[PDB]
From a paper:
The reaction center (RC) and light-harvesting complex 1 (LH1) form a RC–LH1 core supercomplex that is vital for the primary reactions of photosynthesis in purple phototrophic bacteria. LH1 collects photons directly from sunlight or from the peripheral antenna, light-harvesting complex 2 (LH2), and transfers excitation energy to the RC. In contrast, some Rhodobacter species, such as Rba. sphaeroides, possess dimeric RC–LH1 core structures, representing the largest photosynthetic complex in anoxygenic phototrophs.
Cryo-EM single-particle analysis determined two distinct classes of RC–LH1 dimers (Class-1 and Class-2) at 2.74 Å and 2.90 Å resolution, respectively. Compared with the Class-1 dimer, the Class-2 dimer (66 polypeptides, 152 cofactors) displays a slightly reduced length spanning the dimer (196.5 Å) and a tilted angle of 158°; rotational and lateral shifts at the monomer–monomer interface were observed. Consequently, the continuous S-shaped LH1 array fractures in the middle, resulting in two separated C-shaped LH1 rings with a narrower opening (~20 Å) in the LH1 array than that of the Class-1 dimer. In contrast, the continuity of the array of excitonically coupled BChls is interrupted at the monomer–monomer interface in the Class-2 dimer, resulting in a ~23-Å gap between adjacent BChls from the two monomers. In Class-2, differences in the RC–LH1 association occur at the dimerization interface, and the two N-terminal heads of PufX are further separated, due to the twist of two RC–LH1 monomers, compared with those in Class-1. In contrast, the N-terminal domain of PufX (Ala2-Pro15) is not resolved in the structures of the monomer and Class-2 dimer, presumably due to its disordered structure when not binding with RC-H and LH1-1 subunits of the neighboring monomer. Moreover, a putative UQ-10 (QY) that associates with PufY and is close to the RC QB site was identified in the cryo-EM maps of the Class-2 dimer and WT monomer, whereas it was not visible in the Class-1 dimer. The head group of QY is located near the cytoplasmic side and is sandwiched by the aromatic rings of RC-M Trp41 and PufY Phe7 via π–π interactions, forming a quinone-binding pocket. These results, together with the distinct BChl arrangements, suggest that the Class-2 dimer may serve as an intermediate structure in the formation of a mature RC–LH1 dimer from monomers.
Residue numbers in the entry:
A (entry chain L): 1 to 281
B (entry chain Y): 2 to 52
C (entry chain H): 1 to 258
D (entry chain B), L (entry chain 8): 6 to 49
E (entry chain A), H (entry chain D), M (entry chain F): 1 to 55
F (entry chain X): 17 to 68
G (entry chain M): 1 to 307
I (entry chain 9), N (entry chain I): 1 to 54
């Protein structure tokens, strides 16, 4: 169950909690203290989703939906059949996520690599906590969070999006969408470039990093470099998540009307708010 | 307690940005005028750390 | 073909979505097999092939023709460590840590490990050495930021163990890779630029303590560094993060200390 | 004598004999459990 | 069905027992949840109606 | 070197870390509760995004 | 509070790299532009040279005329007023013809006829550029991965503007040329087709768009984590596996059970992003032509509670 | 057909058995779930109607 | 049944007890939450209706 | 139960005691919140 | 057969202590189940 | 005598007696708290 | 006709058999689901109507 | 016509056979699916009408 080179890196230490109490491998996985919490919260969260399907009365996996408590319950406890289960799953999901990030931290220290990966994952968690915890708490109801369903958490997105008209006009959303599109553009370009330099035309030698820079300089006149593109990949993803977390935390808390109405401030600037012609007036 | 030149440069730029933004939001008839002037000065200040 | 269903609710949209699941299942299989060209077949904790190899079979081998006449590389292929691993089994049952038999930083195990790469310098597209000192580099100079040359080198124990002398530069990428730190004994070690933090007046190396600076593996040639020497240097310094924790004076290091 | 796992034939026989005893014990508890349910609430 | 012991020459005992433990637990959990879903064979609901716990 | 104190100190050490993490989480929840109360959410608040 | 390698802490500026010369016609290649210190903090500081061949010229001419035609219509919509032009810049739009004209080219020049001209220029511009990516890879002797990764993007781009309008038999179904208009076109697309969220293929594209962000955040952080071992030089790690490749392999092997290689991770990278638009093109293509309401389609396929 | 034993000279028994084990379980699960879906052949609901469990 | 001690000749006690500890506590929490969800056997709810806590 | 002491030769004592402190506190937190969730047994409400 | 390194006697001692814990755990469970069944039967 | 933690048998016995004493003390206080609540609000 | 055996000189026997095994199963699953979807040839439903399982 | 065998000196037999096999199956699926779509040539419904299954 070990790779041809895995043995020399399997050494004690690097644990945050427990020392050697949980410092062992189950197959390929490293357990650690936080992996035990990971497995428990993961298993408990999964079972309560399955049990929530029993209470709902359906077994179709797409119809399974763990709705959060209704708006009348506010930010308090709810009956397990009508919102209470969602709160337990959310606590289990929050515990599983943070334990997973901290388990990655232990693996980082054991290998001596940087903590970029758990720091990158923490951005996703704060994005997750924005939707289920930070936004509902500010709005004072767990019902503003999204249900744990495959196609019912899309209903939440559509309903929350159309609460404020066309959600595209959210300015933080436009920033994040540009980042998400840019990151996927960068990933396709970055993935394709290395494969082109590593799996070239038949018979020709494997290419060097200079050909990678030469290709993109002949293409768009600029090469960001092997270090730059991976920095770009990390920052593009985190910025997309950071602005996506920002876009929702200001919606329903600081902005309440249609987002298209927001953009009229630019049109209503003092020096051209009254000039005739164009689209607006 | 061991801030670098770049760390201090950013901190002052944030202070300059807030300060100048309020300055020209009062002076101008709109908050955007403060944002532009405050942002440009802060960006110029933060992009030139002495070293 | 709006609403045209071949049978039941199955229609052209239903045809496409299932056909993609077949395609995606096939694609995930293809992608996973490609990832199995390195580190396979699996081995027991002693070194013999394990009874378990995974649900995905090994792919048909492919050959990479290395640049500059370095040869060819066919994977998957017989891969060997080519170095004695100074580790001791801590439990007969598998999935348990192996403790170092001696000094792990010197033995190249754990976080301080390194791989037997080709003992040759890495070449650019033109056949010249990719990583060269800035002194031997033609026209290279510090363009921005604090110049680290001449700054004192402070270890994780908050003790100065030398000063920077030269910077090594990746000539194609045109970015610094190593700091050539001269110790108190007159010899110069190489420190990866990723493991140092050039502050206003000093080069703080959080990885290594002052006494461990002398232990960095040395390069055979002052004008070039081979791939093997890079791994030993990079392994040794990065191994210092866990193996010099008792010597680190940081508050968080004390909290996480054993 | 493929021996992928390295067990000898004698070791396999002993491991299997204990494994089957565990299986028949598990099956025996299940058969009793199904009898209890079928008596209390038959599904046929 | 006499030489079934040779399965352990093919399959590692440690991996199978973990796989079997996970398989049996998840299979057992699945069947219990299937029974609980149906109004009949949901023994929790059965006893409530049998002894009139609804009131 | 008292064994009873040493064991109790370890368990108190774990309980303190769990206590700080839990109290820190409540601090964030309380902070967002305060900010939401300060902002004019109750004056104009969105309808239910999902069916109750 | 240490060096995270996010930004370079020192810059070195040697002579400009003129690049390789496998089969690239150096006459068509330009000279080296400036060195940007601001870009040097993140990546390389050198800008240029850029190759400009036959397809490069056709790409620029059509690309400029596409950009110019939108601009002239933007000025006409502004009344040639620079103040109005900047005020309504995002609200300007080069709308496609009205639904009455269908696919006919009889639309008036100010009522959709100009859009056909601008769209033609973009069509030539993009396809000529795709060949440019193909030929640049062929010139250096590299794989055509960029050419086919690009063709995934073209498939969605072709579907939105060209293929789907033909099947719907109307240019009015195409995309307007504007900042807010093509946002409004997007929103109106879902509403007309009944909650495009319940499009299975749109959901898949979001899976791979989320996954591309997931994989690049994972991959970018991984290499920066193992950059202290020289892991950013991925091509050498493919050729000669160093300790960075092994640790990067082991981190994900100990985290999620399985891992990849230094070369196989980029196969995940290319396919994760390609499927973003590949599944996207089918998802848009089916909408209207096959499914006039996805939520009703979702109900009949067990994706919505009703029916 | 006596040479069917040669399939093990081509197919690794370790991978086949795991694939066969997963395939047989998923195939067994799939047929059971198809039967449980139909109003008939759902043995849980049949007994409820036969023994008047629903009241 | 007397040969079941050989399971420890195969499984290391350290990993099993960790696995068993998680499994039992997971199982125990699972059952209590199932009973709480149902209107019957929700002992907190049973006493409230029995003693008119509403 | 006369040989339960041997479990301390399996698991390191100080590590378990720290982990047990975490487990006991979180379990105590778990039960108290469930009680507050129910309309009854909510001491912070029935008092007022 | 050796995987964990325990001798036959060490396993027998280990199993006996483990079984002692199992029956003690089972006994509390049986007492608990009787208490619940008396208080509220589920059959 | 497995020696996974290195503690001798005597140290294990002494530590367990300490741990059990605290366990029964913790159990006793919890019983009192449960008695107090059941008096205040029975849950059966 | 006779020389069809040479296809194994071209095609890898392992690759074909795995591909064939997947192809046959998916084809068999497809046709069975086609028959189940139609109101006729759905042998589960037609037998239910034959013996009046549901009325 | 008699020299069509030469085309195998240009085309790799393996890739052609795999490409041909996939194309033939996918084409076969497409036509068999098209016929099912139309009320005519839907042989499943054709037999149903003939033998009065519904
Ligand atoms: C109310 C709005 C609707 C909606 C309506 C649509 C519509 C309509 C579409 C999408 C599409 C997409 N949607 Mg949706 N979408 C909604 C909600 C969401 C949510 C969400 C959390 O709510 C998410 C994450 C997404 C996500 C996505 C993406 C996965 C996908 C676009 C891929 C892409 O890169 O396109 C952008 C990239 C391209 C179009 C490719 C461009 C390639 C060409 C070659 C570039 C040429 C450049 C040109 C010449 C300019 C050059 C400039 C110079 C270089 C300077 N949608 C709701 C339900 N969505 C698309 C799709 O494929 O859906 C299946 C689509 O058509
Ligand atoms: C060793 O340290 C170093 C770093 O590396 C660690 C660095 O990254 C950098 C490089 C960084 C810069 C050159 C610029 C950094 C400065 C900023 C972050 C600018 C701050 C920007 C704002 C205040 C945002 C608001 C500005 C707005 C919106 C105004 C603009 C509006 C319109 C024009 C319309 C330097 C110099 C460096 O020294
Ligand atoms: C939402 C945010 C949640 C954030 C959780 C962060 C947890 C970080 C744990 C850091 C532990 C540092 C430390 O020294 O703890 C000592 C102790 C453990 O000490 P120890 O005895 O394991 O030793 C640690 C040092 N080594 C392993 C190197 C020997 O920490 C604890 O008490 C456990 C952490 C409690 C976790 C709370 C979860 C709720
Ligand atoms: C193209 C992008 C597709 C994105 C959608 C799928 C992403 C998940 C792919 C999971 C995968 O391939 O895991 C295989 C792995 C298999 O790994 P494994 O743990 O079985 O061991 C590695 C297996 N061998 C040795 C054959 C390589 O799955 C898992 O480990 C569990 C993933 C659960 C999902
Ligand atoms: C994870 C999936 C992410 C990407 C989803 C893309 C769209 C998938 C759905 C689709 O196309 O459905 C219609 C198509 C075709 O619909 P159909 O009607 O032929 O079959 C569905 C059968 N009924 C009607 C009974 C529901 O569905 C499928 O092909 C089945 C895909 C099922 C995927 C289920 C994932 C379950 C995950 C575990 C449960 C977690 C709950 C929390
Ligand atoms: C309900 C949930 C059930 C989950 C478990 C399903 C297991 C299916 C049967 C597996 C089996 O018989 O093989 C055990 C095997 C035992 O063999 P193994 O674990 O040694 O696998 C080694 C890999 N081979 C042998 C192919 C080289 O377990 C597995 O490999 C796990 C397969 C899980 C697949 C999940 C989908
Ligand atoms: C959705 O579909 C539903 C659920 C409705 C219907 C379900 C359908 C299906 C697919 C059902 C599937 C059922 C199956 C596959 C059941 C299989 C059960 C089996 C085979 C269980 C095995 C049990 C074996 C046990 C419990 C063995 C225990 C053994 C021990 C405790 C002893 C271990 C110790 C050993 C071997 C000592 C080792 C020896 C030496 C010398 C070291
Ligand atoms: C939607 O369609 C529905 C579901 C409605 C209808 C379904 C249609 C389809 C597609 C049906 C498909 C059915 C198929 C393909 C069934 C195939 C079944 C087979 C082939 C089953 C095989 C079973 C074999 C078993 C269980 C063998 C077990 C073997 C052992 C227990 C012994 C193992 C040990 C060995 C070999 C020891 C090794 C020996 C030595 C010397 C080392
Ligand atoms: C769907 O969900 C519901 C709940 C509705 C239905 C679910 C049903 C299912 C799947 C139920 C599952 C039941 C099972 C399989 C339960 C398992 C029970 C077992 C086997 C429990 C075992 C308990 C054993 C214990 C607590 C042992 C304790 C041992 C000790 C405290 C002593 C340990 C110390 C030792 C051995 C020291 C020895 C050391 C030396 C050096 C000799
Ligand atoms: C689903 O959740 C709900 C709430 C619905 C129901 C929950 C169900 C479940 C699954 C509950 C789980 C219960 C469990 C697993 C409880 C376990 C309890 C145990 C075994 C606790 C052990 C406690 C042991 C302690 C506190 C030992 C302490 C020992 C010492 C401190 C050392 C001795 C030193 C002493 C006494 C001196 C201390 C010094 C001073 C100055 C006082
Ligand atoms: C829009 O679409 C609709 C449906 C409306 C109408 C469709 C229109 C279209 C586009 C139709 C297209 C039809 C086409 C292009 C049909 C083509 C058919 C062909 C060319 C079929 C060829 C079949 C050949 C086969 C199956 C050959 C099999 C050969 C073997 C099994 C033996 C191979 C073994 C060898 C060579 C042994 C190797 C020998 C040595 C010496 C190593
Ligand atoms: C002062 O500024 C000047 C005037 C100097 C220059 C400024 C120009 C400006 C301000 C340009 C602004 C451009 C903008 C805002 C562009 C925005 C473009 C966007 C957002 C496009 C989004 C989607 C577009 C798509 C999907 C287009 C697809 C088009 C095709 C697939 C081509 C279709 C081909 C057709 C219809 C051919 C028809 C013609 C014939 C002859 C058959
Ligand atoms: C004939 O049976 C009686 C006497 C009961 C007749 C009674 C009839 C009536 C009217 C009964 C009244 C009510 C009912 C319906 C009672 C039903 C009771 C049931 C279903 C009891 C079931 C008990 C099941 C138990 C205790 C199962 C225990 C099993 C385990 C703990 C699994 C252990 C296996 C392990 C750990 C395998 C691990 C192995 C490896 C290799 C990992
Ligand atoms: Fe990369």
């Amino acid at each position: 169950a070990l790779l041809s080179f895995e043995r020399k890196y399997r050494v004690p230490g690097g644990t945050l909690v427990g020392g050697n109490l949980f410092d062992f491998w189950v197959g390929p996985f490293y357990v650690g203290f936080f992996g035990v919490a990971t497995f428990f919260f993961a298993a408990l969260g999964i079972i309560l989703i399955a049990w929530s399907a029993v209470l709902q009365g359906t077994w179709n996996p797409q119809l399974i939906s763990v709705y959060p408590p209704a708006l009348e319950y506010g930010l308090g406890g709810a009956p397990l059949a009508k919102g209470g289960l969602w709160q337990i799953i959310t606590i289990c999901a929050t515990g599983a996520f943070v334990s997973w990030a901290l388990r990655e931290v232990e693996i980082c220290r054991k290998l001596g690599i940087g903590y970029h990966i758990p720091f990158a994952f923490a951005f996703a968690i704060l994005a997750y906590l924005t939707l289920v915890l930070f936004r509902p708490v500010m709005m004072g109801a767990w019902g503003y969070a999204f249900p744990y369903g495959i196609w019912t958490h899309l209903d939440w997105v559509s309903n929350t999006g159309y609460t404020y008209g066309n959600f595209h006009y959210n300015p933080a959303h436009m920033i994040a969408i540009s980042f998400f599109f840019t990151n996927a553009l960068a990933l396709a370009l970055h993935g394709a470039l290395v494969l082109s330099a590593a799996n070239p035309e038949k018979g020709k030698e494997m290419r060097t990093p200079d050909h990678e820079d030469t290709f993109f300089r002949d293409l768009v006149g600029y090469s960001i470099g092997t270090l730059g593109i991976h920095r770009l990949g990390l920052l593009l993803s985190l910025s997309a998540v950071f602005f996506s977390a920002l876009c929702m935390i200001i919606t329903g808390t600081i902005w309440f009307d249609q987002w298209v109405d927001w953009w009229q401030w630019w049109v209503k600037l003092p020096w051209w708010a009254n000039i005739p012609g164009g689209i607006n007036g | 307690p061991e801030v670098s030149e770049f760390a201090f440069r950013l901190m002052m730029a944030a202070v300059i940005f807030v300060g100048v933004g309020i300055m020209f939001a009062f002076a101008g008839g709109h908050w955007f005028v403060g944002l532009v002037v405050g942002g440009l000065v802060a960006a110029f200040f933060a992009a030139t750390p002495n070293s | 073909m709006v609403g045209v269903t071949a049978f039941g609710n199955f229609d052209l949209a239903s045809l496409a979505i299932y056909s993609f699941w077949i395609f995606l299942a096939g694609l995930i299989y293809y992608l996973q097999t490609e990832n199995m060209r390195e580190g396979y077949p699996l081995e027991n904790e002693d070194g013999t092939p394990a009874a378990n190899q995974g649900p995905f079979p090994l792919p048909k081998p492919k050959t990479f023709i290395l640049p500059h006449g370095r040869g060819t590389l066919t994977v998957p292929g017989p891969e060997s460590e080519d170095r004695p691993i100074a580790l001791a089994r801590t439990a007969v049952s598998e999935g348990f840590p192996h403790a170092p038999t001696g000094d792990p930083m010197k033995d190249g195990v754990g976080p301080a490990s390194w791989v037997a790469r080709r003992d040759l310098p890495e070449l650019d597209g033109h056949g010249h050495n990719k990583i060269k000192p800035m002194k031997a580099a033609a026209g290279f100079h510090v363009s921005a930021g604090k110049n680290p040359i001449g700054l004192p080198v402070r270890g994780c124990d908050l003790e100065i163990a030398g000063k920077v002398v030269d910077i090594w530069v990746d000539i194609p990428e045109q970015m610094a890779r190593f700091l050539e730190v001269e110790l108190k004994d007159g010899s110069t070690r190489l420190l990866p630029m990723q493991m140092v933090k050039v502050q206003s007046n000093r080069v703080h190396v959080n990885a290594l303590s002052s006494d461990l600076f002398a232990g960095i593996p040395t390069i055979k040639s002052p004008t070039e560094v081979t791939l093997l020497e890079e791994d030993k240097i990079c392994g040794y310094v990065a191994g210092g993060l866990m193996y010099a924790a008792p010597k680190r004076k940081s508050v968080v290091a004390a909290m996480l200390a054993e | 004598d493929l021996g992928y796992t390295g067990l000898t034939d004698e070791q396999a026989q002993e491991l299997h004999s204990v494994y089957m005893s565990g299986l028949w014990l598990f099956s025996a508890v299940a058969i009793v459990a199904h009898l209890a349910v079928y008596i209390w609430r038959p599904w046929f | 069905m006499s030489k079934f012991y040779k399965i352990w020459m093919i399959f590692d005992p440690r991996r199978v027992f973990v796989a079997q433990g996970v398989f049996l637990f998840l299979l057992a959990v699945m069947i219990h949840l299937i029974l609980l879903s149906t109004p009949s064979y949901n023994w929790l609901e059965i006893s409530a109606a049998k002894y009139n716990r609804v009131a | 070197t008292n064994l009873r104190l040493w064991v109790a100190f370890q368990m108190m050490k774990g309980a303190g870390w769990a206590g700080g993490v839990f109290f820190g989480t409540l601090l964030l929840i309380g902070f967002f509760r305060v900010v939401g109360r300060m902002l004019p959410i109750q004056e104009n608040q969105a309808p239910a995004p999902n069916i109750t | 509070a240490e060096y995270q390698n996010i930004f370079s802490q020192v810059q070195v500026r040697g002579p400009a790299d003129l690049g390789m010369t496998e089969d690239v016609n150096l006459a068509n290649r330009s000279g080296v532009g400036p060195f940007s210190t601001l870009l040097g903090w993140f990546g390389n500081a050198q800008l240029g040279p850029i190759y400009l061949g036959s397809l490069g010229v056709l790409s620029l001419f059509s690309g400029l005329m596409w950009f110019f035609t939108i601009g002239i219509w933007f000025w006409y919509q502004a009344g040639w007023n620079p103040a109005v032009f900047l005020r309504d810049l995002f609200f300007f739009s080069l709308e496609p013809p009205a639904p009455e004209y269908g696919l006919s080219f009889a639309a008036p020049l100010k009522e959709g006829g100009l859009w056909l001209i601008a769209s033609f220029f973009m069509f030539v511009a993009v396809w000529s550029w795709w060949g440019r990516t193909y030929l640049r890879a062929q010139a250096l002797g590299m794989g055509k991965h960029t050419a086919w990764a690009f063709l995934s993007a073209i498939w969605l781009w072709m579907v939105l503007g060209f293929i789907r309008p033909i099947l719907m038999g109307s240019w009015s179904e195409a995309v307007p040329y504007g900042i807010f208009s093509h946002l409004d076109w997007t929103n109106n697309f879902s509403l007309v087709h009944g909650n495009l969220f319940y499009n299975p293929f749109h959901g898949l594209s979001i899976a791979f768009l989320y996954g591309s962000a997931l994989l690049f955040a994972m991959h970018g952080a991984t290499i920066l984590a193992v950059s202290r071992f020289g892991g950013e030089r991925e091509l050498e790690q493919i050729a000669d596996r160093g300790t960075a490749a092994e640790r990067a392999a082991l981190f994900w092997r100990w985290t999620m059970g399985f891992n990849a290689t230094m070369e196989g991770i980029h196969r995940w990278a290319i396919w994760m992003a390609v499927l973003v638009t590949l599944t996207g093109g089918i998802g848009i293509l089916l909408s209207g032509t096959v499914v006039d309401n996805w939520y009703v389609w979702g109900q009949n396929h067990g994706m919505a509670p009703l029916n």
